Amino acid sequence: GSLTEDGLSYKEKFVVRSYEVGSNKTATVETIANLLQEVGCNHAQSVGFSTDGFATTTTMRKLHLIWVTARMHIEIYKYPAWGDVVEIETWCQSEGRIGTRRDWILKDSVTGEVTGRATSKWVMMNQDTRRLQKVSDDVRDEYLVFCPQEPRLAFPEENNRSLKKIPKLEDPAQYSMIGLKPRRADLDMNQHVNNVTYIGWVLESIPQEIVDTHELQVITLDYRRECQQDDVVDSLTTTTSDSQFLHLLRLSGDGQEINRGTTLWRKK
Amino acid sequence: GSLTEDGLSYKEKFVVRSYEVGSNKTATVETIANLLQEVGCNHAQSVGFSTDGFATTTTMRKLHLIWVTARMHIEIYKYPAWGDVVEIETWCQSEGRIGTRRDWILKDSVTGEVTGRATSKWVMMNQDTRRLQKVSDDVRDEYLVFCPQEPRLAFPEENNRSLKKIPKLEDPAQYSMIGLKPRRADLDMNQHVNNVTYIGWVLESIPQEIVDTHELQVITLDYRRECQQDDVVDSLTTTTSNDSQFLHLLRLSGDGQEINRGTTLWRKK
Ligand SMILES: COCC(=O)NCc1ccccc1
Ligand SMILES: COCC(=O)NCc1ccccc1
Ligand SMILES: COCC(=O)NCc1ccccc1
Ligand SMILES: COCC(=O)NCc1ccccc1
């Protein structure tokens, strides 16, 4: 991978692996999400950001400050097949005191056609108290030199799917998958559950009939609270309609919300 | 990746990804196992083997015959770090009517030093009845032309760890992790649980204290029965031992039907 000519974005190509594909012999949405994460990490490394905590600086490490994902939104037009090469371009942009936005464009390496796009919102917080904090000018100036100054949006539409408010699913859920627990392969280098595992858990409550007759087109996911490595999760889904679903991930005991989201599926 | 000059082995390089590493910032044993699987699949594809079923031919597909892993044995000297490049060489050799053996050598791309090795045993089975059956000369001849004829062993030693018999763990287990279920990311393109998920499930019952103070050196795993996508598994571990050794058992949560057994050897960091 490499930073582009103007140094304001980063590109990387990936060959889709045999264990990365589903029943259709095309990459899963979790494989796609892992690749967005990988290119995001390579972009931060390329410009000197910390190898201990994603997108942190010496200034943030002293203050025990981290960046956390608030929302992830992915739209796929064509899933690459096993053996195919996908090229991914990513860039970051400031969003004031609220936080930051990282966007991605996925392309077919051979044709050059856009096969997907993603956008994510990040907020700053103290890693110990878990309290959200406003980004100071000192922290802001550090990353602004690596962002384009004119708005570059993967989802430019005024009032598009990526910015829609997500409601809370009401009991009883139409479908559910309970007792979901993370194993060591679900944890990152800091022993935290990987953001991609939550996408998998959300999709666990979609009936196999939907998965067999449809392809996932859009997924929007809010990250409200972290699942600890010894927590147990219940994944809940209700049809709201193409097929549309409302999703809720909550702790198996007290029902504390960890994530909420929506999915849109297209008939094969 | 590519077949080597003589066409009797295959090499591929991989850059270790950020999500592929553990707390030590080095690749997990499941990341290593996924890469051995990937290079194994690329080698079969490079010489015309089926894209629907691993290492099958038109002859095998007609008879509903598949190859299944009976045993996997991995030894790691150094786990590659995030950003490092690992080069893997793999080859296959016939083992008579019993089945085949696929071996691997892992190397550091920069230094050229061997950082690991693996060996696996495969048996042929009817995919519908799940009945094992000896390999016929017709099936044998099809793959022999892609194998070296002189013995090429990743574990050459006459009485070595890769061929040791594994005993059945007796209750009560010293440690356990109960209620393990596969999710969709654990399934392959044919809806079967990925062979690597079983390695993860085995390791789920190792205490976190061992994982924090030791590094995994050797893992040997027998595959006895397949876990269906709606089965629930219990992972059991007992210490059998400077170095730490463990005996492992994976069985169905209800009736206790054995799916896997194995051993692990850990070295103090
Ligand atoms: C360390 O992560 C870097 C990154 O860019 N992450 C993207 C992502 C966010 C949420 C879900 C899936 C993927
Ligand atoms: C937390 O904000 C998202 C993010 O990726 N920030 C670091 C970064 C910004 C600009 C270029 C490269 C890396
Ligand atoms: C389709 O698999 C091709 C292959 O060579 N797999 C090796 C393997 C066997 C068991 C556990 C992990 C890896
Ligand atoms: C089932 O045995 C393991 C295996 O990988 N067989 C296929 C093969 C043999 C020789 C070269 C390349 C591919």
Side-chain angles (χ1 to χ4, degrees):
Chain A
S2 173
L3 282 161
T4 59
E5 196 80 88
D6 70 353
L8 303 177
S9 74
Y10 191 90
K11 287 180 176 165
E12 188 168 1
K13 287 175 206 166
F14 299 96
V15 167
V16 178
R17 296 168 181 177
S18 56
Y19 61 82
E20 282 176 344
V21 308
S23 3
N24 20 46
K25 281 193 208 67
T26 66
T28 61
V29 83
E30 300 179 69
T31 283
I32 300 297
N34 275 324
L35 303 193
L36 306 183
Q37 181 167 68
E38 176 69 0
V39 72
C41 287
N42 290 335
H43 186 190
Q45 195 291 119
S46 87
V47 292
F49 285 111
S50 183
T51 69
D52 285 336
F54 177 75
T56 75
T57 54
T58 49
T59 302
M60 283 173 88
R61 288 180 252 129
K62 234 82 107 301
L63 268 8
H64 287 36
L65 298 173
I66 56 162
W67 288 104
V68 148
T69 312
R71 168 118 110 195
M72 178 59 147
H73 180 86
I74 307 183
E75 290 196 11
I76 306 298
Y77 308 126
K78 272 190 200 162
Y79 289 92
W82 164 33
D84 284 358
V85 178
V86 52
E87 182 169 67
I88 309 183
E89 180 176 18
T90 189
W91 67 94
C92 280
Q93 210 140 46
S94 174
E95 291 213 322
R97 330 288 292 188
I98 319 161
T100 238
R101 199 189 76 251
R102 174 169 287 274
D103 290 6
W104 301 247
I105 299 286
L106 295 97
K107 280 178 172 174
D108 177 344
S109 231
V110 181
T111 71
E113 83 185 62
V114 171
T115 59
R117 42 175 190 168
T119 184
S120 71
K121 307 260 186 296
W122 300 80
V123 290
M124 198 173 73
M125 79 168 198
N126 180 283
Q127 78 210 28
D128 302 302
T129 68
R130 302 302 287 199
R131 293 180 62 79
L132 268 97
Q133 204 175 122
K134 160 262 289 309
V135 39
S136 66
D137 301 10
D138 251 43
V139 171
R140 184 169 309 117
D141 292 350
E142 287 186 311
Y143 76 85
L144 280 180
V145 307
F146 309 114
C147 300
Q149 304 208 293
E150 275 193 79
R152 196 197 169 173
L153 299 168
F155 296 84
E157 314 94 8
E158 209 171 338
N159 277 213
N160 65 275
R161 302 171 162 151
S162 73
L163 309 178
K164 205 158 66 169
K165 174 66 218 313
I166 305 165
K168 189 160 180 177
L169 186 148
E170 285 180 17
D171 285 316
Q174 183 180 21
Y175 309 112
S176 69
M177 174 61 88
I178 73 179
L180 294 169
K181 303 184 302 191
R183 59 188 178 95
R184 283 194 199 104
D186 295 302
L187 308 180
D188 65 12
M189 57 187 87
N190 310 138
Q191 299 190 291
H192 288 269
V193 173
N194 193 300
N195 295 128
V196 178
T197 304
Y198 301 94
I199 295 177
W201 286 338
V202 161
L203 300 168
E204 265 312 272
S205 60
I206 292 280
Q208 193 59 61
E209 78 205 35
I210 301 299
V211 182
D212 288 339
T213 61
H214 292 75
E215 281 228 317
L216 179 70
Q217 182 154 356
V218 185
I219 181 173
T220 312
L221 191 57
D222 281 345
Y223 285 79
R224 184 193 195 89
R225 183 150 307 202
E226 187 168 61
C227 168
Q228 310 294 322
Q229 77 177 276
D230 55 6
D231 280 331
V232 179
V233 174
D234 293 354
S235 174
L236 309 169
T237 296
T238 298
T239 310
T240 51
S241 41
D242 283 4
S243 290
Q244 258 174 87
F245 299 89
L246 183 61
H247 301 277
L248 180 63
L249 295 198
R250 72 189 183 197
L251 296 184
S252 214
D254 66 344
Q256 175 76 260
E257 185 188 341
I258 66 168
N259 290 85
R260 69 174 72 170
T262 63
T263 58
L264 173 85
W265 299 70
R266 59 196 203 250
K267 256 198 62 152
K268 293 170 180 181
Chain B
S2 171
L3 282 162
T4 59
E5 197 74 58
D6 70 353
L8 303 177
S9 74
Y10 191 93
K11 287 180 177 165
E12 188 167 1
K13 287 174 206 165
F14 299 96
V15 167
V16 178
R17 296 169 180 175
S18 58
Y19 61 83
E20 282 176 345
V21 308
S23 48
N24 317 134
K25 280 192 207 65
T26 66
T28 62
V29 83
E30 300 179 69
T31 282
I32 299 298
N34 275 324
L35 303 192
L36 306 182
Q37 178 164 259
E38 176 69 359
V39 71
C41 289
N42 290 336
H43 185 190
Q45 190 175 335
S46 79
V47 292
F49 285 111
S50 182
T51 68
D52 286 335
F54 178 74
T56 75
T57 54
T58 292
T59 302
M60 283 173 88
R61 287 180 252 129
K62 156 214 173 182
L63 302 173
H64 289 37
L65 300 167
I66 57 161
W67 287 105
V68 294
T69 312
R71 173 180 277 187
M72 177 59 146
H73 179 86
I74 307 182
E75 173 157 25
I76 307 298
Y77 308 125
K78 273 192 199 160
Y79 288 93
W82 164 33
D84 284 358
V85 178
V86 52
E87 182 169 68
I88 309 183
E89 180 175 18
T90 189
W91 67 94
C92 182
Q93 283 213 293
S94 174
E95 291 213 323
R97 302 189 88 87
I98 318 161
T100 78
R101 198 189 75 250
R102 174 169 287 274
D103 290 7
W104 301 248
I105 299 286
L106 297 95
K107 280 177 173 176
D108 176 344
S109 230
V110 181
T111 71
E113 82 185 351
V114 170
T115 59
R117 44 177 192 168
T119 184
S120 70
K121 307 260 185 295
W122 300 80
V123 290
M124 196 176 69
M125 194 188 71
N126 179 284
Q127 68 199 133
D128 300 305
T129 69
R130 247 59 224 291
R131 293 179 63 79
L132 295 185
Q133 67 169 86
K134 301 287 110 69
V135 190
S136 66
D137 302 3
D138 251 43
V139 172
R140 183 167 59 189
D141 293 350
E142 288 185 311
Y143 75 86
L144 280 180
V145 307
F146 309 114
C147 300
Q149 304 201 103
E150 277 196 85
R152 197 197 168 173
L153 299 168
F155 296 83
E157 317 94 357
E158 210 166 326
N159 267 195
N160 82 86
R161 301 172 164 150
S162 74
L163 308 178
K164 204 157 66 158
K165 175 66 218 313
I166 305 165
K168 189 160 180 176
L169 186 148
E170 282 179 8
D171 285 316
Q174 183 181 20
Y175 309 111
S176 68
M177 174 61 89
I178 297 318
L180 295 168
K181 302 184 302 196
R183 59 185 177 95
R184 282 191 197 105
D186 295 302
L187 309 180
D188 65 12
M189 57 187 87
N190 310 139
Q191 260 111 330
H192 289 269
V193 173
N194 193 299
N195 294 307
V196 177
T197 304
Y198 301 94
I199 295 177
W201 286 338
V202 161
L203 300 168
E204 266 312 273
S205 60
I206 292 281
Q208 192 59 60
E209 291 97 330
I210 301 299
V211 182
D212 288 339
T213 61
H214 292 75
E215 281 233 280
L216 179 70
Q217 278 217 245
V218 186
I219 180 173
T220 313
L221 191 58
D222 280 346
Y223 285 79
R224 184 193 195 89
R225 183 150 306 203
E226 188 167 61
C227 168
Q228 248 62 228
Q229 76 175 276
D230 54 7
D231 279 331
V232 178
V233 174
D234 293 355
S235 175
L236 310 168
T237 296
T238 298
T239 310
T240 51
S241 42
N242 210 138
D243 280 3
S244 289
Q245 258 174 86
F246 300 89
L247 183 62
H248 301 277
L249 180 64
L250 295 198
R251 71 189 183 197
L252 296 184
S253 213
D255 65 345
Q257 174 78 83
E258 184 189 340
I259 66 168
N260 290 86
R261 68 173 72 171
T263 63
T264 58
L265 173 85
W266 299 70
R267 125 151 295 120
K268 256 197 62 178
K269 293 170 180 181

